[PDB]
Structures are given as structure tokens and as C-alpha cells.
Design a protein around this ligand. Structure first.
Ligand SMILES: CC(=O)N[C@@H]1[C@@H](O)[C@H](O[C@@H]2O[C@H](CO)[C@@H](O[C@@H]3O[C@H](CO)[C@@H](O)[C@H](O)[C@H]3NC(C)=O)[C@H](O)[C@H]2NC(C)=O)[C@@H](CO)O[C@H]1O
Ligand SMILES: CC(=O)N[C@@H]1[C@@H](O)[C@H](O[C@@H]2O[C@H](CO)[C@@H](O)[C@H](O)[C@H]2NC(C)=O)[C@@H](CO)O[C@H]1O
Length: 342
């Protein structure tokens, strides 16, 4: 039963690792180490070496059984560009593989994660396959030479097995992934947001083609062992500005991004509700939304998280993950999730 949380280094001043309730997790990720083109000597951003080193001893103090991984990359164009450059260059791949393994050992992490959004089109998937195959082999070799248990290896994946479901250019090779990786973190969110002129459920479990269940179904149908899938749950919501204050449900017309630039942490959503916003549970999508005046936000709440976690158990999945733990400062949703699986 994998109970996974991502801690982003950007949040250190407001949410240091000491604030994570590690009792509610089995694995905690440090996000992110950088690719460091053109040498591809993978590293944490210079200046954050102390934070990276202290992360694992700190989180283990509250739950010694908890393990940690360091995630390399992240969302966004710069990371994607760097992976694409890296994966086409055999010498660069070698430097990346060696330095990433060294990095995990240097800071006392138990594993590595790759966050590459996304290995498409076909050429990019083919070259990513080369990188990951080489990384798997080197991880096994390092275990042999050091005598230590092999580093864990995971990666972030799109919600769906096909890239992309409306126009397939490539797809995740599930047998390859199951053999080389301990699990994948399924990013079952960002289905809807301010890029649309209507409100919607950003992480709908079901409904539409853009749902967590449809995505999970696609990986399983391709042949992914269910235990290799870890269901992502966001600790943030997507927000809109409403066109009309009297149209406040799902599918209401919108005029752009709400605060803050279209995303609001769960903790800020709790503040929003305490400040007069009305919370609504949407049973159709298994999600929540809240609104006040011209601001509308869709997110996961106590009820929808319990339902999603039970869904993951019903579907025989490896577990669940939260992005990102700094966004639920009181750990309300990680608590519900942990209690639900137990
Ligand atoms: C596994 C996963 O969920 N991956 C993707 C997420 O990483 C991504 O969340 C966003 O991550 C970036 C990088 O950590 C965040 O950007 C940072 O934001 C802070 C605060 O605003 C700012 O100080 C930093 O400068 C900025 N760093 C960078 C490198 O841009 C961003 O806040 C995260 N967004 C949310 C909503 O949590 C999500 C969403 O884009 O996508 C996942 O696929
Ligand atoms: C061809 C087309 O219109 N495709 C739409 C997708 O762009 C859209 O995907 C979403 O795009 C957002 C803006 O780039 C991203 O923030 C978000 O991650 C992404 N979500 C997914 C699941 O791919 C989808 C979903 O709204 O709709 C398609 O119609």
C-alpha cells in the first residue's frame, strides 16, 4: 500500500520538510533535481544542497519507516527540452545515468523519479526508452557493487496510456515500464481549468473522456500490472472567474483564471470557504467546488479523496500520491486517504 507525497523545494520558507506529517506516508519525494544541460551532471539547484541533504533525516524523525525518492525534471517546457536533447545523445545519457545514481546516494535517498512531460512524439518515446533501460541496468549494477538494496525507480505518467487519447502519436510501453520501474505516478488531474471558458471538475474520477478512471482503465487494458499504478490526487484546485455571479455550478460560463493564476492550494481553498465561499460536492464527477462572488474553484475535498482512495483499492492499484504536500498544511486530505486505505 503505497502512500506517496511530493514536497517541492520552492516551498521551503513557508513549508519546510519538518512540517510534513510523514506518519501519513510510505514514500516522500523531493521535487526537483535539475538535468543541468549540457553536461547532464544531475544536481539539486546550487544553493539548495543543505535542504536536499537534510530532507530524508528530517522526514524520517516522525516516521522512521518512511522512504524517500528524489525526482528529476518537472513539468514545463525547459525540462521537456532538456530531456529531448539528453535522450538523443548516448554520451549524455551515460553522464545522466551515472550522476543521477550518485545524487540519490549522496543525499541519502532510497530512489529516483523521472518527471518528463512528455515523451512524445514517437522519436522522443524511443529515446526515452533508451535512457530508462540504461538507468534500470545501472541501478542494478550499483546494487551489486555497493551491496545495498537497489534504488527505487519511478516516473510520472500522463493520466492516459496514450499520448494523446484524441490524437495518438505514441503511448507508454507498459511491459517495458513494469519490468524497469517499481511503479508509475499517474497524474490524474488538470483535466479542466482556466484554458476553458466553462467551469469543470479538474480531477474528475468519472463522468467525458478526461477522467481518472478512464485513464487508469487505459493503463490496465494495455497490460500494466495494477500494483504498478499509483493514483495521483491534487492538493490544489483549478480556479476561474465567473461570467455571471448567479451561474455558479459545473459548466458555468467563465472569463479567465481565478486566483492565483488559475490554481489555489487546498489550504487556501479552506480559507476561501471560511471567508464565505459555498462548498458543493459533485457526485457526478466525484469532486468538489466552491464559489463566492465571481470566483469559482474545483478541487478534491475530504469526501472525494476518500472515494478516490477507495476506488484505487477497488481497482487493485499500488496506492495513491499527492501533489503537493505543502498545499495542505494541516494534512487534512493525506489523513483521510491514509485512514481510507487502512
Ligand atoms: C508530478 C507532478 O504533479 N508534476 C507536475 C507538477 O510539477 C506541476 O506543479 C507545479 O510545479 C511547479 C514546479 O515545482 C511549480 O512552479 C513553482 O511555483 C512556485 C510557487 O508559485 C514558484 O515559486 C516557483 O518559481 C515555480 N517553479 C518553477 C520551476 O516554475 C507550480 O507551482 C506547480 N503547480 C501547482 C498547481 O502545484 C503540475 C501543475 O503544473 O503539473 C504536474 O504535471
Ligand atoms: C486538441 C485539444 O483541444 N486538446 C485539449 C487539451 O489541450 C486539454 O489538455 C489540457 O491542456 C491544458 C493547457 O495546455 C493543460 O494545462 C492540461 O494539463 C491538459 N490536460 C490534459 C488532460 O491533457 C484537454 C483537457 O482539458 O482537452 C482537450 O480537448
Amino acid at each position: 500500500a503505497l502512500k506517496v507525497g511530493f514536497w517541492p523545494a520552492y516551498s521551503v520558507s513557508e513549508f519546510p520538510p519538518s512540517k510534513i506529517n510523514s506518519r501519513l506516508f510510505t514514500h516522500l519525494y523531493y521535487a526537483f533535481a535539475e538535468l543541468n544541460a549540457p553536461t547532464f551532471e544531475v544536481r539539486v539547484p546550487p544553493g539548495s544542497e543543505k535542504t536536499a541533504e537534510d530532507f530524508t533525516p528530517t522526514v524520517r524523525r516522525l516516521n522512521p519507516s518512511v522512504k524517500t525518492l528524489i525526482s528529476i525534471g518537472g513539468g514545463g517546457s525547459e525540462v521537456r527540452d532538456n530531456f529531448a536533447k539528453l535522450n538523443s545523445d548516448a554520451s549524455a545519457r551515460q553522464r545522466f545515468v551515472k550522476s543521477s545514481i550518485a545524487l540519490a546516494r549522496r543525499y541519502g535517498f532510497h530512489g529516483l523519479d523521472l518527471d518528463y512531460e512528455y515523451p512524445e512524439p514517437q522519436l522522443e518515446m524511443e529515446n526515452f526508452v533508451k535512457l530508462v533501460s540504461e538507468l534500470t541496468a545501472a541501478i542494478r549494477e550499483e546494487a551489486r557493487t555497493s551491496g545495498k538494496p537497489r534504488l527505487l525507480l519511478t516516473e510520472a505518467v500522463y493520466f492516459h496510456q496514450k499520448l494523446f487519447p484524441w490524437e495518438v502519436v505514441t503511448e507508454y510501453p507498459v511491459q517495458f515500464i513494469a519490468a524497469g520501474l517499481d511503479w508509475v505516478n499517474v497524474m490524474a488531474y488538470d483535466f479542466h481549468g482556466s484554458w476553458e471558458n466553462f467551469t469543470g471538475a479538474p480531477a474528475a474520477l468519472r463522468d467525458s473522456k478526461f477522467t481518472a478512471s478512464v485513464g487508469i482503465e487505459s493503463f490496465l487494458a494495455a497490460g500494466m500490472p495494477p500494483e504498478k499504478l499509483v493514483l495521483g490526487i491534487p492538493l490544489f484546485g483549478r480556479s476561474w472567474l465567473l461570467k455571471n455571479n448567479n451561474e455558479v455550478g459545473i459548466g458555468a460560463p467563465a472569463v479567465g483564471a481565478g486566483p492565483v493564476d488559475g490554481a489555489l492550494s487546498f489550504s487556501e481553498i479552506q480559507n476561501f470557504i471560511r471567508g464565505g465561499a459555498r462548498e458543493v460536492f459533485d457526485t457526478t464527477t466525484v469532486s468538489a467546488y466552491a464559489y463566492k462572488d465571481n470566483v469559482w474553484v474545483g478541487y478534491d475535498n475530504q469526501q472525494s479523496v476518500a472515494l478516490k482512495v477507495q476506488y484505487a483499492k477497488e481497482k487493485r492499484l499500488g496506492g495513491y500520491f499527492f501533489w503537493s504536500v505543502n498545499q495542505d498544511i494541516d494534512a487534512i486530505l493525506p489523513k483521510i486517504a491514509s485512514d481510507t486505505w487502512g
